[PDB]
């Protein structure tokens, strides 16, 4: 082509193609090695359906329930968006558990692939944090009474125990400040941390390759 020459003359795009076209798939890889990729797909769905719902949801103890109801009954295809957002959340965790089973039962965590295991553990903790913070945004009976119990756990700890509870609630009891902080955690902090550690995971995998046969 001639549009290709214009780009190759300036940025050397051939090096990328030559790198992509030099990789091979060994014969001991089977369908279970798909599982990790499946997990990624679910996360992407959670992003697309998440961003959309940010144009209608209001995070106040006075308007939260009514705005979820409005999404559920008035917006075009709002029921579909919310239901998909709720099902993908559980599918992601199920696929991640199956992926951990696969990785353990093939010895893929041994030398020299230990830091990949560490980054995976961090990613699992982050996914659990997503679930916890998102479970209570509608401000209904179930979410309210689950949040009231979750934040009270780190109180049996010694001296650093009670102050930590403060940082979770923004006060002594559960109210509007806790809702504000949970919304901020759910929509700003966790996506950023997840992207960073996800990038580290994939960089390591690409640099070392898949592990050997059994």
């Amino acid at each position: 082509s001639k549009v290709y020459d214009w780009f190759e003359e300036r940025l050397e795009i051939q090096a990328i193609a030559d790198d992509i076209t030099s990789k091979y798939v060994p014969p001991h890889v089977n369908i279970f090695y798909c599982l990790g990729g499946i997990t990624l797909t679910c996360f992407l769905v959670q992003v697309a359906t998440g961003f959309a719902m940010t144009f209608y949801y209001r995070p106040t103890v006075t308007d939260a329930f009514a705005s979820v109801q409005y999404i559920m009954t008035e917006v075009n295809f709002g029921w579909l968006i919310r239901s998909v957002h709720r099902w993908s959340a559980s599918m992601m965790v199920l696929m991640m558990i199956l992926h951990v089973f696969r990785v353990y039962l093939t010895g893929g965590f041994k030398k020299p692939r230990e830091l990949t295991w560490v980054t995976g553990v961090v990613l699992g903790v982050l996914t659990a944090s997503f679930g916890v913070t998102g479970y209570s945004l509608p401000w209904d009976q179930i979410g309210y009474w689950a949040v009231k119990i979750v934040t009270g756990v780190p109180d049996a700890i010694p001296v650093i125990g009670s102050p930590l509870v403060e940082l979770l609630r923004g006060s002594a009891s559960v109210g509007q400040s806790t809702l504000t902080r949970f919304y901020s955690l759910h929509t700003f902090v966790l996506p950023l941390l997840t992207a960073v550690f996800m990038l580290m995971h994939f960089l390591m995998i690409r640099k070392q390759g898949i592990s050997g046969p059994l």
């Binding site: 697309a48 959309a52 144009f55 008035e74 917006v75 075009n76 295809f77 709002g78 579909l80 968006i81």
Partner: peptide, 10 residues
């Protein structure tokens, strides 16, 4: 199409 229709105000 449904995804784009979502953003048009009710």
């Amino acid at each position: 199409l449904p995804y784009a229709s979502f953003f048009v105000p009710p």
